[PDB]
Design a binder for this molecule. Structure first.
Ligand SMILES: [Ca+2]
Ligand SMILES: [Ca+2]
Ligand SMILES: [Ca+2]
Ligand SMILES: [Ca+2]
Ligand SMILES: [Zn+2]
Length: 316
């Protein structure tokens, strides 16, 4: 919409008060003119057709129960944009300030959220397995990384190449979650997963085998389900990348953590400079080893920790 930029006030999925950038033209639309070519949040209106109608509001207050997912999708979209712009100096996902569009209230009881090659899609969840999936900041940032990966490494979405893609979106989903400092942790989607149960999550980068994901390359999934298990073998790279940031010993292999910021630096450079559409885990190791060398030197500790954490997960 061509209209006046403004700030609206609304409530998130988890009930937190927020301020959302909106654009006023007769209605208040959930359109952010402050970042890039615009951040747009649509109402799918419980249907599959996308993107739907740009979210409209008569009074610029978004405290309705129906608005709760839209506010989180529009607000956390601006957060993940801020991370890539401030932490990696990348303007939107294509590097050219591309417009960011999300569609909330997707389908009915849909327990998933995904980047379909063009925009963000958020189901509302059935209320038991999931609540509205835009509520978790790591959920938004994760699927937003898929937009980033599409324009850089372009890792195909099957086998190990897809498992790296999934893990890349998990790392940068957690790193954005730490960027907002919004009760951060190394789990995946604990905010919108099983509201009746507490202390559980969809995945775990610290403990992937806590929910049955392989934490070692020997334990990887080699079948054909889940497009070769790209959501399954993401636990190997998650365990690798988390040891990079934090350290510790995995299967008798010690790793000296270099912190979140250096890990976030290493994988992004590897993502946009060295990784290819058909990269496998070993090629990822060479890319992460090569990227740390550029940023820190071959004789530096950051290269050493990358070599150690990949040895810990058995990636050679
Ligand atoms: Ca309203
Ligand atoms: Ca949290
Ligand atoms: Ca999380
Ligand atoms: Ca839970
Ligand atoms: Zn994903």
């Amino acid at each position: 919409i061509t209209g006046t930029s403004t700030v609206g006030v609304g409530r998130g999925v988890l009930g937190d008060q927020k301020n959302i950038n909106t654009t006023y033209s007769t209605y208040y639309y959930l359109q952010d003119n402050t970042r890039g070519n615009g951040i747009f949040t649509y109402d799918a209106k419980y249907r599959t057709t996308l993107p739907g109608s740009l979210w409209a509001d008569a009074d610029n207050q978004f405290f309705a129960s129906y608005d709760a997912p839209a506010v989180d999708a529009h607000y956390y979209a601006g957060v993940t944009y801020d991370y890539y712009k401030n932490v990696h100096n990348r303007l939107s996902y294509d590097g050219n300030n591309a417009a960011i569009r999300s569609s909330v209230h997707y389908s009915q009881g849909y327990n998933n959220a995904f980047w379909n090659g063009s925009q963000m899609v958020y189901g509302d969840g059935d209320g038991q397995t999931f609540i509205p999936l835009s509520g978790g900041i790591d959920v938004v940032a994760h699927e937003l990384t898929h937009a980033v990966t599409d324009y850089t490494a372009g890792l195909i979405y099957q086998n190990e190449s897809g498992a790296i893609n999934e893990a890349i979106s998990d790392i940068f989903g957690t790193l954005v979650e730490f960027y907002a400092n919004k009760n951060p942790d190394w789990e995946i989607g604990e905010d919108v997963y099983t509201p009746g149960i507490s202390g559980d999550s969809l995945r775990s980068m610290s403990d992937p085998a806590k929910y049955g994901d392989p934490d070692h390359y020997s334990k990887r999934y080699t079948g054909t389900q889940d497009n070769g298990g790209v959501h399954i073998n993401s636990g190997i790279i998650n365990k690798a990348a988390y040891l990079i940031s934090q350290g510790g010993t995995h299967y008798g292999v010690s790793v000296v953590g270099i912190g979140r910021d250096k890990l976030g630096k290493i994988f992004y450079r590897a993502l946009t400079q060295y990784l290819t559409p058909t990269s496998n885990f070993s090629q990822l190791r060479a890319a992460a080893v090569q990227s740390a060398t550029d940023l820190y030197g071959s004789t530096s500790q950051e290269v050493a920790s990358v070599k150690q954490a990949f040895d810990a997960v058995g990636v050679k």
